[PDB]
Design an enzyme around this catalytic site. Structure first.
Site, PDB file in Angstrom:
ATOM      1  NE  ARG A 251       8.705  -1.170  47.789  1.00 26.73           N
ATOM      2  CZ  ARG A 251       9.849  -1.006  47.138  1.00 26.73           C
ATOM      3  NH1 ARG A 251      11.043  -0.529  47.579  1.00 26.73           N
ATOM      4  NH2 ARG A 251       9.641  -1.368  45.890  1.00 26.73           N
TER       5      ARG A 251
ATOM      6  CG  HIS B  72       0.858   6.584  54.724  1.00 28.77           C
ATOM      7  ND1 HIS B  72      -0.141   6.116  53.975  1.00 28.77           N
ATOM      8  CD2 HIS B  72       2.011   6.080  54.153  1.00 28.77           C
ATOM      9  CE1 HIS B  72       0.321   5.341  53.011  1.00 28.77           C
ATOM     10  NE2 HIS B  72       1.621   5.352  53.157  1.00 28.77           N
TER      11      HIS B  72
HETATM   12  S1  SF4 Z   1       0.918  -1.135  50.886  1.00 30.65           S
HETATM   13 FE1  SF4 Z   1       1.348  -0.813  53.118  1.00 30.65          FE
HETATM   14  S2  SF4 Z   1       2.170   1.314  53.244  1.00 30.65           S
HETATM   15 FE2  SF4 Z   1       1.192   1.130  51.173  1.00 30.65          FE
HETATM   16  S3  SF4 Z   1      -0.996   1.902  51.448  1.00 30.65           S
HETATM   17 FE3  SF4 Z   1      -1.045  -0.355  51.764  1.00 30.65          FE
HETATM   18  S4  SF4 Z   1      -0.798  -0.685  54.028  1.00 30.65           S
HETATM   19 FE4  SF4 Z   1      -0.103   1.483  53.511  1.00 30.65          FE
END
Ligand code: SF4
Ligand SMILES: [O-]
Length: 753
Positions: A446, A100
């Site tokens: 999202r 992250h």
């Molecule tokens: S959905 Fe996006 S922010 Fe969440 S773990 Fe997966 S790549 Fe990372």
């Protein structure tokens, strides 16, 4: 008894399908009814199956998860709370994934080198605390938490909790994988039972088969449009029916992943031959063979009852693209051009972004490369900018090897590090100015305002990677890959044919570089150093215990209007820099929420000075002066990402209670864990009786009890008082967290002191 290890990194931790079977059988003797698959796995993991009260939607289950996975934006605070517990070692298999904090800017290797220098202090802290407490550590560059779990740790029948809301991704391999806040991960690492409200079960029966341009992503884009973002709250979505066998195991994980956007507790598919196939190709054929012997326990019972059934015919499903704004505004791709035209959404696509853990399988990359090679065969390249995020080092090494990465570079793509990057807003984006209106399309999940680039005017649409690739070549939302023509270099008009590609590599997966660091469970004489002057890390001081008194004359900090996700409450992006420092990250508290008083973000009236100013500065002024405060919210408050910082920051700046029409699940649990009172209106119309200037008294805390409402006295400035009732979902375990000041305080009382 079989001795099959849970993963290649824990050769001594065995899968316990024997205990799963024993517990399922104690429970079906008590209930005398068929069990759904999610009921089998969840009740198969109860701490006490003979005595547990089981009522869907009503009782809190005490569960024993098999393992814990953390990503580095939430692992720092879960580990700082584990360090305060004082316990010496984690009780269950646990991992940290460093995905992250790597910002996209220059692409791949260059971005990873920069992140390693910039985030040194944090990577160090996590690697040392991991070595010390027995937590496995996946280094920066290794991949995104859910893809690493699917490839190495998820298996049929596992109960896994992760400090991330897209942990449901592992449902594509038949396990129950649930997103939680850092303090819930501390319970399980500490060895105490984990509590979860017993879920309702929504069944989605799939019929027919996908074909052509329609991919697994279209199933959950359709389901999100049907259920809406608040339709899955308190339920597990259980996919079943004959159409399941036509979806790859990674496609099943795509569908379970995005179930997080309808508020579901998690989603799950039954064990079948597609999962067996994936397990064998990822070096886990012994696990597929053991699951074949326990197969009856890894599929739903015949005739089990779902609380809601939805039926989707895969043979009629068409490509979808959802957004702008919310993930449940679903459109066929065939008509998003016309709708955009009508609504004033920019038709020109600035950036097409594929990959991330939602859509970086080998199959996804192969299908996107198959689109791209048709454009190349006519002398075209992308009109839009185009980025590719591989979900793991193994996928990056394998698509590099099998030629897909070069096809995607030749159409104009830039390959980013194996990290979240643009998906959580870690993107140094400079092609537009802030507030410039523009459209990007992604294969993420999202697409809420400011999620990808912190620009409120970016209209983000989510779709499948092959549709992002076709639309990046065209450069416009007014292009339907199924019907429309592109003009080649040479003047001929041509049409894109539907991508076809292999599900899995014919050869094996190339694992890529060494990225895992096992704990010395020998040595562990590691000392974790947090400098007292660090701006990024800070040890926790315990929160105050409850004084034994009711809460009188509480000031309203802000009455929020409409939608309030955890990104409005505790923004990500640049604030990820402070996820291990509670006082510094608290400077973002509620800066995105809309104040009903003036309908502005980050501008509330300070009751004493009568100046309008920033919400964190106002909360610190109230704290400094002894004014206890409250937040009033609307429906589904705390929707979204799992960050417990959303609950830690109001406790830290002196808040006492959050009163709303309803709460999203993980945020309500996080508020209770941190000693706050999440309360809902017994009548939602009472939200209109409370004005920003009113003072509130919450009375009845001395007699706090499961199922008994609290009394709230609204004190109006003109001397009028109105009493309303407030409901809560506390059981007596949770009231003890409130009385001790936090769940961590309570656990430390129990550790003899
Ligand atoms: S959905 Fe996006 S922010 Fe969440 S773990 Fe997966 S790549 Fe990372
Ligand atoms: O996530």
């Amino acid at each position: 008894r079989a001795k099959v290890a849970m993963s290649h990194f824990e050769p001594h931790e065995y899968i316990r399908y024997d205990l799963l079977e024993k517990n399922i059988d104690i429970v079906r003797k008590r209930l005398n009814r068929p069990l759904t698959l999610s009921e089998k796995i969840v009740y198969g993991h109860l701490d006490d199956p003979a005595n547990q009260e089981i009522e869907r939607g009503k009782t809190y289950l005490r569960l024993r998860p098999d393992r814990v996975a953390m990503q580095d934006a939430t692992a720092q605070m879960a580990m700082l709370q584990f360090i305060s517990s004082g316990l010496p070692k984690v009780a269950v298999p646990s991992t940290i994934h460093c995905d992250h904090l790597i910002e996209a800017q220059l692409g791949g290797e260059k971005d990873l080198r920069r992140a390693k220098d910039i985030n040194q202090e944090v990577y160090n802290f996590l690697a040392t605390a991991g070595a010390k407490y027995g937590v496995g550590f996946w280094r920066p560059g290794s991949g995104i938490i859910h893809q690493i779990i699917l490839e190495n740790y998820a298996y049929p029948g596992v109960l896994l909790i992760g400090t991330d809301s897209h942990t449901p991704n592992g449902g594509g391999l038949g396990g129950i994988c649930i997103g939680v806040g850092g303090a819930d991960a501390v319970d399980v690492m500490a060895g105490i039972p984990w509590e979860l409200k017993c879920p309702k079960v929504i069944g989605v029966k799939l019929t027919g088969s996908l074909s052509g341009w329609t991919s697994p992503k279209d199933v959950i884009l359709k389901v999100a449009g049907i259920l809406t973002v608040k339709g899955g709250t308190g339920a597990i979505v259980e996919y079943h029916g004959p159409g399941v066998d036509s979806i790859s195991c990674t496609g099943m994980a795509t569908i379970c992943n995005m179930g997080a956007e309808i508020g579901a507790t998690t989603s799950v598919f039954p064990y079948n031959h597609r999962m067996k196939k994936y397990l064998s190709k990822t070096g886990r054929a012994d696990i597929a063979n053991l699951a074949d012997e326990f197969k009856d326990h890894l599929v739903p019972d015949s005739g089990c009852h779902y609380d809601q059934l939805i039926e989707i015919n895969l043979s009629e499903l068409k490509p979808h693209i959802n957004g702008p704004f919310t993930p449940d505004l679903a459109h066929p791709v065939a008509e998003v051009g016309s709708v955009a035209e009508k609504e004033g959404w920019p038709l020109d696509i600035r950036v097409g972004l594929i990959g991330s853990c939602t859509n970086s399988s080998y199959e996804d990359m192969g299908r996107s490369a198959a689109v791209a090679k048709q454009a190349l065969a006519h002398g075209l390249k992308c009109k839009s900018q185009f980025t590719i995020t591989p979900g793991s080092e193994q996928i990056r090494a394998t698509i590099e090897r099998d030629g897909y990465a070069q096809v995607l570079r030749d159409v104009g793509g830039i390959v980013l590090a194996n990290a979240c990057g643009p998906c959580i807003g870690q993107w140094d984006r400079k092609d537009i100015k802030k507030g410039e209106k523009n459209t990007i399309v992604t294969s993420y999940n999202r697409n809420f305002t400011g999620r990808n680039d912190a620009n409120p005017e970016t209209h983000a649409f989510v779709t499948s990677p092959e549709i992002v690739t076709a639309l990046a070549i065209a450069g416009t939302l007014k292009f339907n890959p199924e019907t429309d023509f592109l003009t080649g270099k040479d003047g001929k008009k041509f049409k894109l044919e539907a991508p076809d590609a292999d599900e899995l590599p014919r050869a094996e997966f190339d694992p890529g570089q060494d990225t895992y660091q096992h704990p010395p469970k020998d040595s562990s004489g590691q000392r974790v150093d947090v400098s007292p002057t660090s701006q990024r890390l800070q040890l926790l001081e315990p929160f105050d215990k409850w004084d034994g008194k009711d809460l009188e004359d509480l000031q309203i900090l802000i009455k929020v209007k409409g939608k309030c996700t955890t990104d409005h409450i505790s923004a990500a992006g640049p604030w990820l820099k402070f996820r291990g420092h509670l006082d510094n990250i608290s400077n973002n508290l509620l800066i995105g929420a809309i104040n009903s008083e003036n309908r502005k973000a980050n501008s509330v009236r300070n009751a004493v000075t009568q100046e309008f100013g920033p919400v964190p500065d106002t909360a610190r002024y109230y704290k400094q002066h002894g004014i206890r405060w409250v937040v009033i919210g609307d429906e589904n408050y705390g929707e979204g990402s799992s960050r417990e910082h959303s609950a830690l920051e109001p406790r830290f700046l002196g808040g006492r209670a959050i009163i709303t029409k309803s709460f999203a699940r993980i945020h309500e649990t996080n508020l209770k864990k941190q000693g706050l009172l999440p309360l809902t209106f017994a009548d939602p119309a009472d939200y209109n009786k409370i004005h920003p200037v009113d003072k509130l008294t919450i009375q009845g805390l001395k007699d706090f009890a499961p199922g008994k409402p609290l009394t709230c006295i609204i004190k109006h400035p003109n001397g009028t008082q109105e009493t309303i009732l407030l409901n809560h979902t506390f059981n007596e375990t949770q009231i003890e967290w409130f009385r001790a000041g936090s769940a961590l305080n309570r656990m430390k009382e129990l550790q003899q002191k």
